[model samples]
Target: HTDPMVSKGEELFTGVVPILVELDGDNGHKFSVSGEGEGDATYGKLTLKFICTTGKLPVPWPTLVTTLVLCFSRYPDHMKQHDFFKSAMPEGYVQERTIFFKDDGNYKTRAEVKFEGDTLVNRIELKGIDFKEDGNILGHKLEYNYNSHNVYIMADKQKNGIKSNFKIRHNIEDGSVQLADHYQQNTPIGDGPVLLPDNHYLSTQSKLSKDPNEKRDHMVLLEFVTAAG
Candidate 1:
């Protein structure tokens, strides 16, 4: 039989439902990464709206970077939430999440994600950042297991012939996830040495809430606007 929580999670991830995501962290830091799902269940899309209320003028610079990194790092966990849709989904799903880059307006980055039953592949491209170097594109390959909620990810290229791999565990019940380095090498971007020590892990805690009025059939869309600076 289908688990009720799993069914709910499937609907939450695949349906055209809107949600409010509020994150609070250390040092009184808080922000919102709220958005909704679009299109149909088979070939749907997820769009996230980012909002920052503290730290800078016009646009919160740090918050923008933090949001982008968060989305990229935690994407596999996000996909696992709707494992039930994997079989029915199309070859690829489009993810369009927005971030405030300049004082003028918001910029968007696109990620095309595909699931091959056991593995997930993501091709991410930035608006102005060119990832094509000598025909070598940038992408990520992820191997995940829904039952164990364990994910292994590898980048396309690394410095000094060193490859970068990361292992992640997603615990949806507790709204938390953990990540660790699976292989040690130079920085993935050739910046410097490895950042974390061996066997060291980093974790993030998240909370998912819905609009009180949003029901199964009758759903309410919650919109978040940027606060006045």
Candidate 2:
């Protein structure tokens, strides 16, 4: 419903990055604006702004943006694949490792991370999730789901791969499994804009270049609701 490009910065080198908006329709790329339950309209409007690293893109940036949006949107969907270990440890725990995740654009988020050699990891309460194959091969996958109030860890899969003590509660129902910390306790994801790569923005221009400065970072911006106040 709006132009993808906001402004390219007068075609100058100072502002080489071009800001591009995402496209969504009632039928296509339908994102969740606000909904939680199975009966409640699960999907809603989704949008994004892709900041171009260079004026020239290998593929139509918008097309790639579309794919990214779909995957990022699926981040939470796939996040549901994960489970947690409840009372398995006798101590009731697994390896507690700090991990990382992402959120939608500009919106506030709560994440904690630590590096293992070069690769990143997270808390044992929330593992088996990693970054995207490319960038979120980069961790936007889990954060898309993990960083919310509605989606909880539910239960942990023990080392032997068994779900123990899962009979707590259900989704948004009574007493159920809570998140590792208050990260998911923030605003539910659907009520606000949908951003990507968290605050770090996956700069597509991190390739080899004559000028190292040209290899700077680029990010994406997202919108969830329709165009209006």
Candidate 3:
């Protein structure tokens, strides 16, 4: 037998659906949650509570809890979330690297990337974030690139202990490089909602190191559209 309040609480907990809302501002986008909860002093108050489940648990728990919460909130379904995650990478993000090495080395790497839509800028930064079970912060470096199709990468390799030297050139037929000699900035004119159809969005793809003996050599690719006239 359970107390009526306890039963109601369990029912609410089991049925509660969490929702994720993004607040867009001049700086960038931010994430938040909406739900219900209840509490009171002595008598207490009952309320439905929603929480941001970002990095909540291992395996399916986080994903499952997120899905359930969103459902109850009348928010966009799980399929939408899957599509968003599949086709788009966050502007600024971090992830835990799972691939391990067999050698006696104690260092492991994590990948971080960022992009700015307004400035049409993209960057990929890799770091030796931590060591194996030692919880030590390792040094890292940033590989910065600009102008998607024709890119320029800047890195401080020699001083940073980063020994990976690899480069890939984009090869496309009839897609030769075009340079603007006297590049002048121009603002779009006209009103009527002021839509800039000429502007384009950028895309990024990344692959982490899969070596069984040494965890290095992960790959990241970024593609973006730029004016060429």
Off by over 4 Å in 3: 1-80, 83-90, 118-229
For residues 1-229, what per-residue lDDT tens digits would candidate 1 score against the true structure? 1445444334433534332333322212233232223222323232343333333212222222222311122223324332322322324344444433221223344544444342233444434232222211111111111212222222224322222234323222234332322332222222322212122122332223334554331112211211010
lDDT of 3 by residue, 1-229 (tens): 1334223222332332222222111101122222222222111112232333332211111111111111111111211211111112223222212212122111122322222321111121112212333211111111222232221212122221111111222212245321211111112111111111222211212121222552322212211112111
Ranking by TM-score: 1, 3, 2
Point out the higher-scoring one by TM-score: 1 or 2.
Answer: 1
lDDT of 3: 0.20
Candidate 2 local accuracy as lDDT?
Answer: 0.20
lDDT score, candidate 1, position 11? 43
Question: Which is the leading candidate under lDDT?
Answer: 1
RMSD of each: 19.5, 21.4, 23.5
Off by over 4 Å in 2: 1-43, 69-229
lDDT (0 to 1) per candidate: 0.28, 0.20, 0.20
